[PDB]
Amino acid sequence: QQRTMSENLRRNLAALEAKISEAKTKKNMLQARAKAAKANAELQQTLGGLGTSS
Amino acid sequence: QQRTMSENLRRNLAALEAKISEAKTKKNMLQARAKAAKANAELQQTLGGLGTSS
Numbered sequence: 001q002q003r004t005m006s007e008n009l010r011r012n013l014a015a016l017e018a019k020i021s022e023a024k025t026k027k028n029m030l031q032a033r034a035k036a037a038k039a040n041a042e043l044q045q046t047l048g049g050l051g052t053s054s
Numbered sequence: 055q056q057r058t059m060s061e062n063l064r065r066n067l068a069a070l071e072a073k074i075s076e077a078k079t080k081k082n083m084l085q086a087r088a089k090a091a092k093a094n095a096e097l098q099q100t101l102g103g104l105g106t107s108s
Contacts, residue, residue: 036059043063047070054077 033056036056040059040063043066050070050074054074
């Protein structure tokens with residue numbers, strides 16, 4: 001009974017490590033998309049300042 | 055999605071560079087027209103002084 005529980009805990013750890021590592025890499029990717037969106041906001045804001053100064 | 059955004063930013067840069075470079079060359083041209091208008095103002099002002107001294 002202890003070895004069937006020991007394998008069941010190994011499966012629980014393997015599933016948990018997979019979903020944690022997936023969630024962390026996807027969070028880094030969406031933060032890089034948000035950094036690109038911030039750069040497009042700066043581009044439009046400086047284009048507005050180029051418009052009023054020109 | 056990042057490459058379609060990357061091309062969209064390339065289009066935004068190309069349109070911005072075109073309208074900035076157009077506005078700067080037109081501003082140099084109208085400043086040269088204003089320099090010619092200033093020269094015609096000096097010509098009429100000195101013609102007035104030639105009139106009163108003559």
